[PDB]
Amino acid sequence: REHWATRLGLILAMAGNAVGLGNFLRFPVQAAENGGGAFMIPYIIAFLLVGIPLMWIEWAMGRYGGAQGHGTTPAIFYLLWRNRFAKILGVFGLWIPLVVAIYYVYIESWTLGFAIKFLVGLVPEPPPTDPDSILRPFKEFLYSYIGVPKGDEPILKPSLFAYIVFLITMFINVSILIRGISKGIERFAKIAMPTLFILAVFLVIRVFLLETPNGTAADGLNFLWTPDFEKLKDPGVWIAAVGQIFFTLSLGFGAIITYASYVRKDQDIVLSGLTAATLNEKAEVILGGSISIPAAVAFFGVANAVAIAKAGAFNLGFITLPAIFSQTAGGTFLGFLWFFLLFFAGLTSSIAIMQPMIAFLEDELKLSRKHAVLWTAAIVFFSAHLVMFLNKSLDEMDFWAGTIGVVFFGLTELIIFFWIFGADKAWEEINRGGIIKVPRIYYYVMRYITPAFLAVLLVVWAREYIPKIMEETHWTVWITRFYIIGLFLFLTFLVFLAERRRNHESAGT
Amino acid sequence: REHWATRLGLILAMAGNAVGLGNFLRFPVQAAENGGGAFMIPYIIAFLLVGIPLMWIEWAMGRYGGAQGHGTTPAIFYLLWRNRFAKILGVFGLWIPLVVAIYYVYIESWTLGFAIKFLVGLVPEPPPTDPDSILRPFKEFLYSYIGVPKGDEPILKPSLFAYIVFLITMFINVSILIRGISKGIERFAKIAMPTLFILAVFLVIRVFLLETPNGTAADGLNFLWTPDFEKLKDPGVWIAAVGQIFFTLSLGFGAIITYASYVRKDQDIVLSGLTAATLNEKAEVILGGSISIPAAVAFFGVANAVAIAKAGAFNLGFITLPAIFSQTAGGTFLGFLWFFLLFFAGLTSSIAIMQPMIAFLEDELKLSRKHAVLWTAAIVFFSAHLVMFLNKSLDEMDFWAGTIGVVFFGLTELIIFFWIFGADKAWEEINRGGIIKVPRIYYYVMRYITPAFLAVLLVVWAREYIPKIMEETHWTVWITRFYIIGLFLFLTFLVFLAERRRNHESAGT
Ligand SMILES: CCCCCCCCO[C@@H]1O[C@H](CO)[C@@H](O)[C@H](O)[C@H]1O
Ligand SMILES: CCCCCCCCO[C@@H]1O[C@H](CO)[C@@H](O)[C@H](O)[C@H]1O
Ligand SMILES: CCCCCCCCO[C@@H]1O[C@H](CO)[C@@H](O)[C@H](O)[C@H]1O
Ligand SMILES: CCCCCCCCO[C@@H]1O[C@H](CO)[C@@H](O)[C@H](O)[C@H]1O
Ligand SMILES: CCCCCCCCO[C@@H]1O[C@H](CO)[C@@H](O)[C@H](O)[C@H]1O
Ligand SMILES: CCCCCCCCO[C@@H]1O[C@H](CO)[C@@H](O)[C@H](O)[C@H]1O
Ligand SMILES: CCCCCCCCO[C@@H]1O[C@H](CO)[C@@H](O)[C@H](O)[C@H]1O
Ligand SMILES: CCCCCCCCO[C@@H]1O[C@H](CO)[C@@H](O)[C@H](O)[C@H]1O
Ligand SMILES: CCCCCCCCO[C@@H]1O[C@H](CO)[C@@H](O)[C@H](O)[C@H]1O
Ligand SMILES: CCCCCCCCO[C@@H]1O[C@H](CO)[C@@H](O)[C@H](O)[C@H]1O
Ligand code: MET
Ligand code: MET
Ligand code: NA
Ligand code: NA
Ligand code: NA
Ligand code: NA
After folding, report:
1. What is the DSSP string of A309-378?
2. Is A136 annotated as a binding residue?
3. Which domain holds residue B310?
4. Where does the chain bind phosphocholine 2 (chains A, B) (predicted)?
5. How many domains would you assign to chain B?
């Protein structure tokens, strides 16, 4: 089995895993839609009661599985709970990162395509004051790229450039992953993360200098970091904050687990996991929070910046921000640095969500790294044609895997590790080899508070929020549902083949 | 490896393979649309120049592969041609019967649902002379069953009864296939085929007694068996006749090959294959030809019977015939016997098109029969939800696999066996163990005439007929195309896993 060469490489790879498009695109939208500072109290509490404990659990499960040659949850869940139902629940930790990769790599490719177009100056020129005469050209620019429907048919028409840039993006992911853990993922992370940090700081500084008749960047920071205790009784904010915590830290994705399975059995996971989790939050609240919102608030004021955020997840990052930058000197290049930042942020996360599938093929079906990587790319590339060509397929995949799936899988893996396997065995496995120990209070948080927190959250979700999505959507959602259910069955069949191969292997030695 | 117990069982199983819904539903529609007797000259020539030679080739390939423990074309194509490209072309002989099973078993289930409803008398009552007041209730009866779209959305809404009858149909297929070759397929065929023959003869006799002011059954037989030499210059008729020959004899489906791989290495295939092929043609031209057309012609006259046939493939068998029967004493029960005949005809063919997938899983991935059958059922059952719920998905699958696919695969397997492997080695393999020898002229037919016949046919197809289907269809065809292309990739991945398993097996002994 491969291992992380250096401790820094481990940290930066796990930080690259977490620090992605969730920090710079998703977080600003979530915070703005949910009252800015009103979102932040629930967010900080969710980091403390869910984010930190689950991160530790996933490192522990990972390292534990890796010590026996298993990187993924079908096998690992079985080690912790010797039951057939554990292998089947384990499939979600292959399915979730597979479904996420299918749309996530595609969005990642947009940032590469935009970066190329912004560098070379093939960008829209707004007329040289009206807010709609400035935003519209950039809206049309995004809409032509991805091919937003112009009529009634729920069909997308990606531009030829967008399609080819997706191929290149797939190729860049393959070129890193094919070199492995230490020579691929680890080496790249040591380059990407410093680059990512420098680009983000420069952008924050530039944005901090923005001032118009409508306000300054400081007004954005006031909006984001000013508490509103009247939203603490709103369950919608709590649900939003916990979902962002999961997405942002890569929890319930099976990706922290796969990476941790390359950590040596003896090596520290307590301080290392805390550092990775803390690095992500800095990149999220300080860097990600200080770019999009303050720029939007400076140019448009608070109320218009909120309305922009509610309109679309991609509105703020792909339309509004570049439009704002175009009104400043050197703004096209500043647009390039933004999209380049997003590309590197995405690339380090997409190599993380494809590694579980690769680890499964190597560990359980004994494929070489070359074949495991190429087949994984092939499945992701093929399946992405659904997201590329069917309108709202992306949204459906993001909901079932990236939103519902991750919270469900987070609760599941906590139950399996801390209740079934055993709380005291779990607690010991977490702390073993630790440079620091997990604060004692977290034993009771992990065992009682976190599972009750997530169970109540998921109950309110299924009752008050998902009956609408099951009944008030266009019929084409069943195409995506049909396909991703098929993907689960496919992966189940692979788990079946893996165990039959094991049975023949045990009848041969 | 399993083997057919008796020679009769072999014959009746291979006859059950060929004699299906193609004989009783597809053939009447094809003949009527193409000028009746005008269709028959090309049909007889296609039987002689394509049907007979290819049947022999598929028995030979099958038996040859079976002698080395291989039932399916990925392996068999490789034995005949030791090239990587041969295994990939071999996938079509898993893909075609898999895609065909997905829609064919569903249509088979309609005949079971209709049989149950006709037996119990839950049928429409037409008013006790107007042709539309009689046909409409039966049209509505079929349309409610399968859930034909009432609006603009390309969405089907199967009745609860139809869905449950599909489950039962899947279960009946499983219950036969799970018992194996001799104890399942062979035992059932010895019951089904005699039953099928008796039911068909009784129906022919009953139909022969039909006489109205618009004509008799004899007028139907005159229409069908009267030559029109002015259509012999029409390429559309030739294309139609060859397509029916392929479909009707199960050629290019990989199903004759899989069945033949259970024939002992020494056993006769020349007389046995000719008998099976000849039994099918009797059931097709004498039995299938004498039911639907003569009844339609008796009640409506020739021109109206032709128009009915052009309206739909299911119009004649599921709407018109039962409507005609309802005007006769005991007609509901006669409706039952028709649908019962269709069910048994379908069931013996669907167990044949699922056996390739089962043979692959047993032979190459070393799954037990139980697991191979259940996983095959699972994939077919799951994938059938596409055909059940998306309007015209059935048509798209029938075209790419059941129409284009089979002719392409027929030409491919002939090239591999008679050109690459070697004409003289092929000829020897066919004749070895023969109770009779293949007439010498067929060597030159197999080597020169048949391949040139099919190549010219496929050229005119791609030039004059398929650009319309690629450009003049609704966008929803790309859902079915996307899914069945995914199925090909899935099966390719399984061929990849099968060879990796072989490589580990050869490094273990
Ligand atoms: C291996 C997967 C094949 C699935 C068929 C998808 C064909 C892709 O179609 C391509 O889409 C691009 C983006 O819209 C267009 O610019 C190209 O003209 C078109 O060839
Ligand atoms: C970074 C490498 C990706 C480059 C892909 C180029 C795809 C070609 O894209 C073409 O460009 C033309 C000129 O701009 C346009 O007029 C055409 O509409 C477009 O199809
Ligand atoms: C679920 C996704 C199915 C993949 C279908 C890919 C669409 C390829 O289809 C082609 O796309 C081109 C560009 O969009 C169009 O110009 C062509 O008319 C169309 O045939
Ligand atoms: C759920 C929120 C918990 C976060 C608070 C963590 C602060 C650490 O809490 C510390 O833990 C140490 C080790 O158990 C104790 O020795 C100290 O008394 C205690 O202050
Ligand atoms: C491609 C085949 C899809 C067929 C399934 C469509 C059945 C229509 O079901 C639709 O489902 C939607 C989402 O749950 C709901 O919002 C709609 O109310 C409902 O009409
Ligand atoms: C394992 C495959 C699950 C895919 C979801 C398909 C759910 C089937 O849906 C069923 O369809 C029937 C026929 O229209 C209806 O009569 C039933 O009310 C409905 O439950
Ligand atoms: C042969 C066994 C299959 C029987 C399945 C029965 C499915 C129940 O079907 C129900 O039947 C009712 C009474 O006819 C109808 O009123 C309902 O609309 C229908 O849902
Ligand atoms: C590609 C096929 C996707 C499978 C979708 C199955 C549709 C299940 O969806 C359900 O179907 C019922 C009966 O049609 C409807 O009454 C319900 O509104 C719908 O939710
Ligand atoms: C392509 C149409 C061919 C069908 C005709 C088959 C009739 C059999 O043809 C016979 O073959 C025998 C064995 O080779 C010869 O001994 C006979 O002379 C010949 O009449
Ligand atoms: C589910 C995603 C499907 C997206 C692909 C639809 C692209 C539209 O392409 C359509 O293809 C049809 C069939 O080839 C043609 O008949 C139409 O002319 C064409 O517009
Ligand atoms: C490792 S991919 C999961 C999402 C990622 N943590 C992000 O924030 O973009
Ligand atoms: C063996 S399934 C192929 C079709 C079948 N020969 C029929 O006529 O229905
Ligand atoms: Na990242
Ligand atoms: Na993140
Ligand atoms: Na049959
Ligand atoms: Na037939």
Report:
1. HHH-TTIIIIIIHHHHHTTSTTHHHHHHHHHHHHHHHHHHHHHHHHHHHHHHHHHTS---HHHHHHHHHH
2. no
3. 1-509
4. 84
5. 1
